[PDB]
Design a protein around this nucleic acid. Structure first.
Ligand SMILES: CN[C@@H]1[C@H](O)[C@H](NC)[C@H]2O[C@@]3(O)C(=O)C[C@@H](C)O[C@H]3O[C@@H]2[C@H]1O
Ligand SMILES: [K+]
Ligand SMILES: [K+]
Ligand SMILES: [K+]
Ligand SMILES: [K+]
Ligand SMILES: [Mg+2]
Ligand SMILES: [Mg+2]
Ligand SMILES: [Mg+2]
Ligand SMILES: [Mg+2]
Lengths: 85, 96, 63, 163, 131
RNA sequence: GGGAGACUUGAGUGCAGAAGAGGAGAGUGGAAUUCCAUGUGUAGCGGUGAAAUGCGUAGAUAUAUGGAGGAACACCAGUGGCGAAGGCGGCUCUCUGGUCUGUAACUGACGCUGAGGCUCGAAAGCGUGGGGAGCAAACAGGAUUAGAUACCCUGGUAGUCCACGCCGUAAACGAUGAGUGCUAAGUGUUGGAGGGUUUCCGCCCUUCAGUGCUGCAGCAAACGCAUUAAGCACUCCGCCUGGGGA
């Protein structure tokens, strides 16, 4: 939802107007991944959509690796807020 | 909220009284289930292109409604609509 | 010429039997767009509108 | 185009191949001849000819070869630089060699180099050894040889500046 | 993705040369400018002009053809590669077509030709053969 | 290569749009087949190269009116569309993936490939529970034939369908791994974008991404490929090293 997306963007934006950044993208990808997991458990035969879920997961992983290699302080701050591992 | 157009064919022999109660009933189903009936109007009484539940005529009634995709108004209309003897057939379509 | 585009209609209501009638043949079959001139996008919309009209008794399936 | 006249060309039969066309009555056997022609002074050519008899096939091959002469750049007894000639299966590597080392070439390559006037050259056939294609591959390599003066002129340099 | 912009530059020249294009453009880099300059002064290309833009700049190369539009450049080969870097010592510096061509070598004295490298008695990474 | 900065083109986000048999779930429509019931009706019907088996006077086939049930979706429909591939075609709704085009607000190389692992994977097959119209391995009968464990005919079970769990193979093919850049043209078509005309409709041009055909340079053993390369290049992976035995 564009409303839920924007409100997550504002909560995690590194500054005013920041749509693109590891924190914003990862957080939006985090609620996208959670919602698609709920869909997945209800529709266990929807293999085509599951592939979209997996690509979202790999993109989130890649952005997390970039954030960790770039600023470990930010990386730790973010994963706590989103409750990642 | 998404916009739906509902058109159902009432059996052509229904009484005027029964039709009014019928039309009122299926607006109340949608209102009760989180849907705003932006309009509902009898369109035409037409000959059918083929026999439908034994009938070759029907009174087409169009409902324009709005509701969240999550709400059960459309599903509830469809459920009660199929059981109803007066309603021959119906279709629910999204509109712009 | 694409009749749908010419008339400047971007919504094809399946209740419009008048419009839909010119796009079916004798026996009620859907005409190819190469025979009617309609464009590919409009042909798909017409097909849905006709099929929805048939299910609601506004157009016949056969004959 | 190198004019055959004014040159004392010599001929070398590289290969004589007996070839068959199958016919209703049996087989029509002919001879296909591959000949290299050259003046041993930097001009060499090759040609093919077919006939029912070997002498007639060679004559046609010789006449074809004279019409297809090419000039080979030559520094002293060897070629200006390394070159790889490729045609079909044939793949011929040719290198400059020190004075007096002879023509270290095999097969049809020897005929082309000797009739062209190259006396010292190292070569290796790396592809198929079908005589027609190695001969063709050789000339493709020789046509890639460049003269220092022509290279210098094309680059706007003196031959010393290039080297 | 593009992993060897130098090899891309050499190939753009090779492909443009094949069809005898008058000019050619490439995204700029210091090493690409170094290579273009060497081609310029060694007589392989006619000219080189530089364009200042917003991304990384652009280098325009003017290809050179002789009388009858004979190609001055025969071919260009990338020697050192991302997959296999090639290094030569001062005594290993290559001669390309017995000196009728050039090798572009990157040294601690800069990017220079094979002639220059063995004059200074230094080696380095062999970038490309040009003949 | 390492370290500290800077950058915006690659990559991604935002914003604005576009198309779609992409997937999953739950409903639903007509045509037709079969069976069933009831009239009408009378000796055939069905089938082959020709026949017979078979069905029918216990009333067939045909025809009319209905009822049941399953499976598949005519026309549209198109080197058309979508998907990683396998694949996806009635209609409606719910949930859901991806792609494409503008814009250039944001991030600032975050990228590519990817052994091992994991996931998906036609059809047949397997397990449990349903369903079963049509079709049909097996099988039966009738033919053909020298013989026929076939082709042909009449039947017909599994299977084909659904749920769930296995299987993991196909000339699973473009018999062509993925990413990137570069290198004549012509002409279709699908979805976009921009402008110049056109009263609109549309035409004209520019362009992006697909999808085809034709065709240079180059490539190729040849056949052929050719901006959707099999051309010119760089990166990473898979794989090959005479045939048979395998
Ligand atoms: C019907 N007569 C045939 C016919 O003329 C053939 N050519 C088409 C002819 O062909 C020949 O001349 C041949 O070439 C070979 C030989 C077998 O038959 C020869 O005799 C062949 C004659 O016998
Ligand atoms: K009903
Ligand atoms: K979508
Ligand atoms: K089964
Ligand atoms: K096109
Ligand atoms: Mg010839
Ligand atoms: Mg199966
Ligand atoms: Mg296999
Ligand atoms: Mg195209």
């Amino acid at each position: 939802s564009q409303e839920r997306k924007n409100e997550i963007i504002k909560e995690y934006a590194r500054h005013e107007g920041d749509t693109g950044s590891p924190e914003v993208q990862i957080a939006v990808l985090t609620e996208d991944i959670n919602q698609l997991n709920e869909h997945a458990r209800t529709h266990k035969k929807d293999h085509h959509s599951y592939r979209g879920l997996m690509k979202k997961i790999g993109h989130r992983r890649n952005l997390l690796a970039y954030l960790r290699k770039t600023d470990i302080q930010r990386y730790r701050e973010l994963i706590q807020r989103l409750g990642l591992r | 909220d998404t916009k739906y157009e509902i058109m159902y064919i009432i059996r052509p022999n229904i009484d005027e009284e029964a039709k009014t109660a019928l039309v009122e009933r299926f607006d109340t189903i949608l209102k009760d289930n989180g849907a705003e009936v932006i309009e509902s109007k009898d369109w035409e009484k037409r000959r059918l292109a083929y026999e439908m539940n034994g009938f070759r005529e029907g009174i087409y009634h169009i409902v324009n409604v709005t509701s969240p995709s999550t709400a059960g108004a459309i599903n509830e209309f469809d459920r009660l609509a199929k059981i109803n003897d007066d309603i021959i057939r119906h279709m629910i379509v999204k509109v712009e | 010429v694409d009749y749908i585009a010419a008339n400047h209609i971007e919504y094809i209501d399946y209740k419009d039997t008048e419009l839909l009638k010119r796009f079916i043949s004798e026996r009620g079959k859907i005409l190819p767009r190469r025979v009617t001139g309609t464009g590919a996008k409009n042909q798909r919309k017409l097909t849905i509108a006709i099929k929805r009209a048939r299910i609601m008794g506004l157009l016949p399936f056969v004959s | 185009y190198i004019d055959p006249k004014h040159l004392e060309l010599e001929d070398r039969v590289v290969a004589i191949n007996r070839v068959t066309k199958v016919v209703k009555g049996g087989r029509r056997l002919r001879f296909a001849a591959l000949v290299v022609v050259g003046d041993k002074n930097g001009h060499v050519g090759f040609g093919t000819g077919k006939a029912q008899e070997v002498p007639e096939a060679i004559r046609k091959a010789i006449e074809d070869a004279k019409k297809n002469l090419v000039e080979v750049p030559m520094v002293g007894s060897t070629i200006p630089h390394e070159v790889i000639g490729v045609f079909g299966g044939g793949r011929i590597l040719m290198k400059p060699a020190v004075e007096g080392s002879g023509v270290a070439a095999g097969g049809p390559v020897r005929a082309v180099l000797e009739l062209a006037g190259v006396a010292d050259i190292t070569s290796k056939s790396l592809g198929s050894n079908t005589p027609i294609n190695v001969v063709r591959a050789t000339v493709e390599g020789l046509k890639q040889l460049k003269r220092a003066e022509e290279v210098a002129a094309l680059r706007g340099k003196s031959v010393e500046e290039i080297i | 993705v593009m992993t060897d912009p130098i090899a891309d530059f050499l190939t753009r020249i090779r492909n443009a040369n094949m069809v005898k294009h008058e000019t050619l453009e490439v995204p700029a880099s210091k090493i690409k400018r170094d290579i273009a300059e060497i081609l310029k002064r060694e007589g392989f290309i006619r000219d080189v002009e530089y364009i200042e833009d917003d991304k990384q700049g652009v280098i325009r190369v003017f290809l050179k053809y002789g009388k009858n539009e004979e190609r001055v450049i025969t071919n260009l080969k990338r020697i050192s590669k991302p997959g296999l870097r090639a290094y030569v010592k001062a005594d290993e510096v290559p001669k390309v077509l017995n000196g009728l061509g050039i090798a572009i070598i990157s040294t601690s004295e800069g990017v220079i030709t094979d002639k220059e490298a063995r004059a200074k008695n230094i080696g380095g990474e062999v970038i490309a053969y040009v003949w």
